[PDB]
Symmetry: C2
């Protein structure tokens, strides 16, 4: 559920990258496109 | 240790939504802004 999910990282450590990278990349990329659009429409 | 860790989800069940909602919302919102920008610059 929580702690156990972490244990998997100790044995594998090749899964957390997918989940984290998904939430992180999405939020980052998302904002990137937003700021770019605002600046484009700004001027 | 294992099973118990899962039980926590049955009691709360308000955590998985954060992770999933983060990856899902990020990917969705991200694309949304992208398509909107392409259309705005298109015309």
């Amino acid at each position: 559920g929580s702690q156990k999910l972490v244990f998997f990282a100790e044995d594998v450590g090749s899964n957390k990258g997918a989940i984290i990278g998904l939430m992180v990349g999405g939020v980052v990329i998302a904002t990137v496109i937003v700021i770019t659009l605002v600046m484009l429409k700004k001027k």
